[PDB]
RNA sequence: CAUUGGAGAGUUUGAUCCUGGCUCAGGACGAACGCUGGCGGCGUGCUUAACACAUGCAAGUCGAACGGAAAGGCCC
């Protein structure tokens, strides 16, 4: 599973397997998947629609894919961050991020009911 | 107590991974060249020889400072 805060990455990450470093940052809605071919394919399959991904280190497709994979695995969903810190999401995480999560969920509700 | 923002590709090997250079996709210009060329709007136009320059023009004005009267102008 990949934690998406409304069609985008939860928080910036930097993953690296072997030598394939991949940097990921969340982006505002409508930004798209600004990523290289392999990392872009990984993100598009994961369902991220607004992300900025850069490929540092080697450009080998397999290693870049593994680096994108563990960069995504390093993602830490806000509820589990709160569980980690023994606090609440309203106490640990940015209000804008939480709000955007509510509007994403509600727009999701709209889509579901419309089905 | 969130962001307005980051894409790669080819090429060392029989094959692989890494390192690594080289090359390319983008944008730009006070540009030139080739082919081509309808119009309008707004800009811009010797980057080199601070090289040598024909010709015209680019700094005059004041008679309410002055003697005046060479012209035009009035009066004989
Ligand atoms: Mg390394
Ligand atoms: Mg060799
Ligand atoms: Mg070969």
Output the furthest CA–CA distance in chain A (Å, rounded): 46
Strand B nucleotides in reach of protein CB atoms, 7 A cut-off: 1-10, 17-19
Q: Is the CB of A34 under 7 A from strand B?
A: yes
Q: Is the CB of A48 under 7 A from strand B?
A: no
User: Dihedral sign, CA of A104, A107, A109, A114?
Assistant: negative
Residues 6+ apart with CB under 8 A from A47: A2, A4, A7
Among residues A66, A1, A7, the alpha carbon closest in space to that of A38 is found at A66
Q: How many CA atoms lie within 13 A of A68 on its CB side?
A: 27
């Amino acid at each position: 599973k990949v934690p998406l805060v409304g069609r985008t990455i939860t928080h910036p990450v930097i993953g690296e397997k072997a030598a394939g470093v991949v940097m990921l940052r969340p982006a505002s809605p409508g930004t798209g998947v600004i990523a290289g071919g392999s990392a872009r394919a990984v993100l598009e399959c994961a369902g991220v629609h607004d992300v900025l991904a850069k490929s540092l280190g080697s450009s080998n497709a397999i290693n870049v894919v593994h680096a994108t994979v563990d960069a995504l695995q390093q993602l830490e969903e806000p509820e589990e961050v709160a569980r980690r810190r023994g606090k609440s999401v309203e106490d640990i995480a940015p209000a804008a991020m939480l709000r955007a999560r509510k509007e994403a969920d509600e727009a999701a509700a709209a889509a579901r009911m419309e089905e």
